[PDB]
Amino acid sequence: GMISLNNRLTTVSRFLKQGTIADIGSDHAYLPIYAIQNHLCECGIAGEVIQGPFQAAVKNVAANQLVDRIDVRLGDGLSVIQPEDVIDNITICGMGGPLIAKILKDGQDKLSQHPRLILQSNIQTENLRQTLQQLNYEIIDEIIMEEKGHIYEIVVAEYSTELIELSSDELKFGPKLLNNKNEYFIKKWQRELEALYHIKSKLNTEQHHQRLAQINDEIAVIERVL
């Protein structure tokens, strides 16, 4: 159609099922707009937690003549989801893994129709995988990619009638990403190693036993997997 998306959100779009997208903390509604303009979805919901992004989303939907196809809603996380909604995809992008985890856990009652989740985590994706496990979700695909020098992870999950247990390594590194360790996987975890050794340059070993035990364990895990 009209809108151009970054590679990060275009990658997310390739996992959308037909029907309705609910985009939580939406990018000015640009992902739902793109999804409808490109015939990936026929309807959208754009959730925003504060007024500025809310009004920008309303403006952009109007400007793209999609008022009757994308509902822009003000509320925190999955609170925007209403009981009459029929939702085929929930997208939560451009957030840290812990925030996406808290949105899904706090909003777990909104997942009863078992939509596909497409989550794009900026950092600490382990917390998100822990939460998906707790919610009877199963990771079906993962992408790890780079844009403007920042490495992002995309996690695609669907409901399972039994809880799917992941190992510590799977939770931290990704059960799909671990089995397909591409250049961006290596780059990400080498950078994390550098960051963890750099913290050890700033912490006296006499004064930070607890924090240093966690950092040294994390280093050992990454050094084993790399």
Ligand X SMILES: C[S@@+](CC[C@H](N)C(=O)[O-])C[C@H]1O[C@@H](n2cnc3c(N)ncnc32)[C@H](O)[C@@H]1O
Q: Measured from the CB atom, is 49 or 219 closer to ligand X?
A: 49
Site string for ligand X, 91-130 (x = CB under 6 A): --xxx-------x---------------------------
Exposed, middle or buried, 148 (CB in 10 Å: 0-12/13-18/19+)? exposed
**Looking at beta carbons only, is 118 or 175 nearer to ligand X?**
118
d(CA 168, CA 187): 20
Q: How far apart are the first and last CA of the chain?
A: 42
Q: Is 8 annotated as a binding residue?
A: yes
To ligand X, the closest distance from the beta carbon of 219 in angstroms equals 29
How far apart are CB 186 and ligand X at their closest, in Å? 24
DSSP state string for 3-16: PPPPHHHHHHHTTP
Q: How far is the CB of 49 from ligand X (least distance, A)?
A: 4
Please give the sequence-ordered ranges of beta strands (E in DSSP) within 122-172, or none if there are none. 137-147, 150-159
Cβ distance to ligand X smaller for residue 9 or 177: 9
Using the minimum distance from each CB to ligand X, give the nearer residue, 8 or 188: 8
- Tell whether 107 is in a known binding site: no
Structure-block tokens of residue 186: 């290596």
Q: For residue 71, state whether it binds ligand X (rule: CB under 6 A).
A: no
| CA distances from residue 202 to 49, 105, 124, 196 in whole angstroms, order as listed | 37, 35, 22, 10
| Residue number, 26 or 133, with CB nearest to ligand X | 26
In the window 14-33, what residues touch ligand X (CB under 6 A)? 24-27
Which residues sit opposite 23 in a β-bridge? Answer: 46, 91
Per the CB < 8 A criterion, the answer to whether 32 and 50 are in contact is no
Give the Cα separation of 32 and 12 in Å (integer).
Answer: 11
Exactly one of 3, 16, 21, 53 binds ligand X (CB under 6 A); which one?
53
**Sequence ranges of the binding site for S-adenosyl-L-methionine:** 8, 76-77
Chain residues that interact with ligand X, rule: CB under 6 A? 9, 24-27, 47-50, 53, 76-77, 93-95, 103
**Sequence ranges of the binding site:** 8, 76-77
